A paper describes a structure:
All structures were crystallized as apo-BorH in the same crystal form we previously used to solve the BorH/Trp complex23 (space group P21 with four BorH molecules in the ASU, packed as two dimers A/D and B/C with the same dimer interface seen in the AbeH structures), and soaked with substrates/products before cryoprotection, freezing, and data collection. Though Trp alone or 6-Cl-Trp alone could be successfully soaked into the substrate binding site of all four chains of monoclinic apo-BorH crystals, crystals simultaneously soaked in both FAD and Trp resulted in a structure in which FAD and Trp partitioned into different chains in the asymmetric unit, producing two BorH/Trp binary complexes and two BorH/FAD binary complexes. The Cl– of the 6-Cl-Trp is approximately 3 Å from Nε of the catalytic Lys79. There are no significant backbone differences among the 16 chains of the four BorH crystal structures, with Cα rmsd values ranging from 0.15–0.47 Å.
Our results show that flavin cosubstrate/coproduct (FADH2/FAD) and substrate (Trp) cannot bind simultaneously to either AbeH or BorH.
Author numbering: 2 to 39, 44 to 527
């Protein structure tokens, strides 16, 4: 009889209550779970697997949890002004007669002859028979997002792959209620006084300021950047990676919005600024927004003013959150009987909406490597490996946004070009320039989005590397050389571009607006 009997979670934000709800659902009566928890809602974005991996596991359909979190729909991230120089402004600048924006949608690109559609687009660009941007030629979603359409028809009929925007505080409160009312999680409202440890350094109990000992065999650190368990009690070092990603501050708020004027944008915006980038996370009646910048290149006051100026805000009569970030990850996410999840584990700037995903993935991987009271080292070693590889792969992917961007107009954008590029990312850029696919998907969407392990082993597929590289203006030196030996396959593949064009008109003309669906839902 060596199985875990008691779990104690420190921290009651999004990570704490996603951890409490999922583990309580997975373990049932076999374990007692106790959570001990002691400002402006600026919005948060997600990835499609959140419904399949997390909410479906809890039995919660979007029709129930979305109205409780003022949730809205996300079809992509839209990158604005990442190729052109100038001020931090909300509207895209013009380049080659086109707006300077590009999309990074979800889903998998179709193939012909087992070659991704991306490579036939690069073929036609090299041939000079088209000048259409990659995202508008290969993604039907681009048209629907420009027409601010919903990702679904009003009666639930799906149309395009999508994720969610929501208020993270409202999500934690919803899950707090669900866990304590339906899953028998004990909520303890108090502060932690001290961490009780045994001879081997394992945590035995959390002691509250009221003097109560929360006894447990397994402890989850969801205390945010504080890392009260993993960093302070367990003394596990944090690996600062701000040398590779320069942004370390944000100034943020939420802005009321008249949705009847131009609708609700069904995508997160990442707006390039002089010393960083600004997010925009739209919801019903309001949008969250924050300027992520580097303190090495911008003063706090100028970032604040640049941020307020973009949105026409009075800087002296606007509620603002001023936050400093911890960019990097712990050397190990799981040490002895202490598992860090969320900001206590790692953090990247939300350029590609990895925050909620890193929690979901850590929760899932914990159940996959769940221990007993012997705490076999292979379980936590394997867990730490998957978490480390997940973070480092996305970290490098994020850096390539700034590295491949052609902007050199401010010290921030130029300095990104002087940073060391990791060898694996250099290899990928070289393969992309030689015409090769990068991390091409080998399954259809149903397997990819049906099995979390499928996506986890290939999270940034070829479509995503093309979305960013081609969106930033980087194009291969030549098309895939095999394509010049298969002219008939090139001729046949063009039907796919017509299929995208057909779907583009169909969705724009028959889909409801994002605003209409949100008002039907809320
Ligand atoms: N597994 C994710 C990968 C992904 C593809 N496009 C995006 C865009 C953003 Cl902001 C995050 C993540 C992704 C998925 O395909 O859903």
């Amino acid at each position: 009889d060596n199985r875990i009997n008691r779990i104690v979670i420190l921290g009651g934000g999004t990570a704490g209550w996603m951890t409490a709800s999922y583990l309580a659902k997975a373990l049932g009566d076999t374990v007692t779970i106790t959570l001990l928890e002691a400002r402006i809602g600026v919005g948060e974005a997600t990835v499609p697997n959140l419904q399949r991996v997390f909410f479906d596991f809890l039995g919660l359909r979007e029709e129930e949890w979305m109205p409780e979190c003022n949730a809205a729909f996300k079809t992509a991230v839209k990158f604005i002004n990442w190729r052109t120089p100038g001020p931090g402004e909300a509207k895209a600048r013009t380049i080659d007669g086109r707006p300077d924006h590009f999309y990074h949608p979800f889903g998998l690109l179709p193939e012909h002859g087992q070659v991704p559609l991306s490579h036939y687009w690069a073929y036609n660009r090299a041939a000079g028979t088209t000048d259409e941007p990659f995202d508008y030629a290969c993604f039907a979603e681009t048209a629907a997002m420009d027409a601010v359409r919903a990702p679904k028809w009003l009666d639930g009929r799906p149309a395009t792959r999508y994720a969610w925007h929501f208020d993270a505080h409202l999500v934690a409160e919803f899950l707090r209620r669900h866990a304590t009312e339906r899953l028998n999680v004990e909520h303890v409202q108090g502060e932690m006084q001290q961490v009780l440890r045994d001879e081997r350094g394992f945590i035995t109990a959390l002691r509250t300021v009221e003097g109560r000992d929360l006894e447990g065999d397994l402890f989850i650190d969801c205390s945010g950047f504080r890392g009260l368990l993993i960093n302070k009690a367990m003394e596990e070092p944090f690996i600062d990676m701000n040398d590779q990603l320069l942004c370390n501050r944000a100034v943020a708020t939420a802005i009321k919005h008249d949705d009847d004027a131009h609708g609700v944008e069904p995508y997160t915006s990442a707006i390039a600024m002089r010393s960083g980038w600004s997010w925009k996370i739209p919801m019903l009646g309001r949008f969250g927004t924050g300027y992520v910048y580097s303190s090495r290149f911008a003063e706090k006051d100028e970032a604040t003013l640049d941020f307020c100026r973009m949105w026409g805000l009075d800087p002296e009569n606007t509620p603002l959150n001023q936050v400093a970030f911890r960019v990097g990850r712990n050397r190990r996410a799981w040490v002895k009987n202490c598992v860090s999840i969320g900001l206590a584990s790692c953090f990247l700037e939300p350029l590609e909406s990895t925050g909620i995903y890193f929690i979901t993935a850590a929760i899932y991987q914990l159940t996959q490597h769940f221990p007993d009271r012997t705490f076999a080292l292979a379980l936590s070693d394997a867990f730490n490996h998957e978490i480390e590889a997940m973070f480092d792969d996305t970290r490098d992917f994020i850096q390539a946004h700034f590295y491949v961007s052609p902007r050199t107009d401010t010290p921030f954008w130029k300095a990104n070009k002087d940073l060391h590029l990791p060898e694996q990312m250099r290899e990928k850029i070289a393969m992309y320039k030689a015409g090769l696919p990068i991390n091409a998907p080998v399954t259809d969407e149903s397997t990819y989005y049906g099995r979390f392990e499928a996506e986890f082993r290939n999270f940034w597929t070829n479509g995503s590397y093309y979305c960013i590289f081609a969106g930033l203006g980087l194009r291969p030196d030549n098309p895939l050389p095999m394509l010049r030996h298969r002219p008939e396959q090139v001729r046949e593949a063009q039907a796919l571009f017509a299929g995208v064009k057909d779907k583009q008109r169909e969705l724009v003309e028959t889909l409801p607006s994002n605003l209409e669906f949100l008002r039907s839902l809320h």
